[PDB]
Design a protein around this ligand. Sequence first.
Ligand SMILES: *[C@@H]1O[C@H](CO)[C@@H](O[C@@H]2O[C@H](CO)[C@@H](O)[C@H](O)[C@H]2NC(C)=O)[C@H](O)[C@H]1NC(C)=O
Lengths: 43, 96, 42
Amino acid sequence: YFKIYSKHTPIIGRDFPQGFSALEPLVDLPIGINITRFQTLLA
Amino acid sequence: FTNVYADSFVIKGNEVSQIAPGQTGNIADYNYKLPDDFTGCVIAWNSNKLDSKHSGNYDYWYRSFRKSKLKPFERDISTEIYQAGNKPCKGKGPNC
Amino acid sequence: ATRFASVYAWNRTNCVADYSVLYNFAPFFAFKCYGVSPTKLC
Ligand SMILES: *[C@@H]1O[C@H](CO)[C@@H](O[C@@H]2O[C@H](CO)[C@@H](O)[C@H](O)[C@H]2NC(C)=O)[C@H](O)[C@H]1NC(C)=O
């Protein structure tokens, strides 16, 4: 079940903050695909 | 319910006993594996009066060959040729 | 078979049975199985 969890952390400009934050559930889409591989989509 | 799904399909009478957790056979293994930890209801009824044809209704297909068993709620509609023998044949083949 | 036999030749089978040899002997025009198709498993 393609479970998507996320968080926007608009706080640490330079790079990985090292900060402690936590992601929240968003959606659990019932796709049922084996999804061995994936790729990005860029504008 | 919280998140409920209704799965609609047509099976043979001798396969009704396979749509249950823990079952094996051509349906449980190659068409649809139901999770062993399963919550829900399986409702089945005879449709001979609706689906059968005198000449035979061939619209309904059953998968008989696959290279592995399915995981819970997995669906695979690929029609790629399966090799039943040792030769790596393509297309309809001597052991394909 | 040297000569093919009619339905009377119902041959009884204490022998280990390997079904891959059947596919090694010849390809088949059709192969159906109520039991699982790879088989070779009492
Ligand atoms: C999910 O995909 C992987 C490959 O992306 C499948 O793994 C292959 O399975 C076949 C048999 O079905 C093997 O012959 C391959 O060697 C396997 N390859 C790898 C890399 O594992 C996997 O079976 C798929 N999941 C399901 C449930 O079929």
